[PDB]
Each structure stands twice: as structure tokens, then as C-alpha cells.
Amino acid sequence: MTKSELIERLATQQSHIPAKTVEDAVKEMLEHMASTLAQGERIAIRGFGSFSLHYRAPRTGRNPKTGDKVELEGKYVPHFKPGKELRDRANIYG
């Protein structure tokens, strides 16, 4: 399911909500989640999961193709931790 397919599905189900509105909302929410993480703030959705940021110390990386070295400054990367319900519903193996 792609971003668009997500919109269509939501739009289909709801008959009392304009599709164009659903499109705006979805796009907005995501951009909201994005800015939040880029601001250094975490996301907490009880039941679904939580988005945070993990630090990556500086390291003398490499160019996997040429082997040449490359200095890499410290940085932050996104990290998601599935909520209970999400874990349970996703794990088909009882």
C-alpha cells in the first residue's frame, strides 16, 4: 500500500468525508510527523508504536564500491518501535 493507495482506501470507506479532504489530511499528518522528528521530538501513538531518534557516533566510513575512506560526522536517524497491538496483530505466528 502506497501513500496514495492509503488515501483511496480511507476515502472509499468514509462516505461522509470528501476524498480531497482525506488527501490533504493524510499528507498533512505525515508532514507533521516528519517535522516533529526533524525538530528532535518523538512520536507516541499508544497501541500503534512510537518514533524516536537514535544517535550515530562519528566514524571513518567507506565507499562500499571503491573502498576509499570517508569521514562521517555524528548524526541522528529515525527509529520505530511497534506498539503492543501492532506487534500482536502483525505477528501471524500465534
Residues near other proteins, by CB under 8 A:
1-3, 6, 9-10, 13-14, 17, 21-22, 24-26, 28-45, 48-51, 53, 75-80, 82, 85-87, 89-93
Judged by CB under 7 A, the chain residues 40 through 69 that form the site for DNA are 44-50, 52, 54, 56-57, 59, 61-65
Question: Cβ of residue 85: shortest distance to other proteins, in angstroms?
Answer: 7
Is 15 a residue that touches DNA (CB under 7 A)? no
83 contacts 45 by C-beta, under 8 angstroms: yes
43 contacts 29 by C-beta, under 8 angstroms: no
Packing angle of the helix pair 3-13, 19-38 (nearest 10 deg): 130
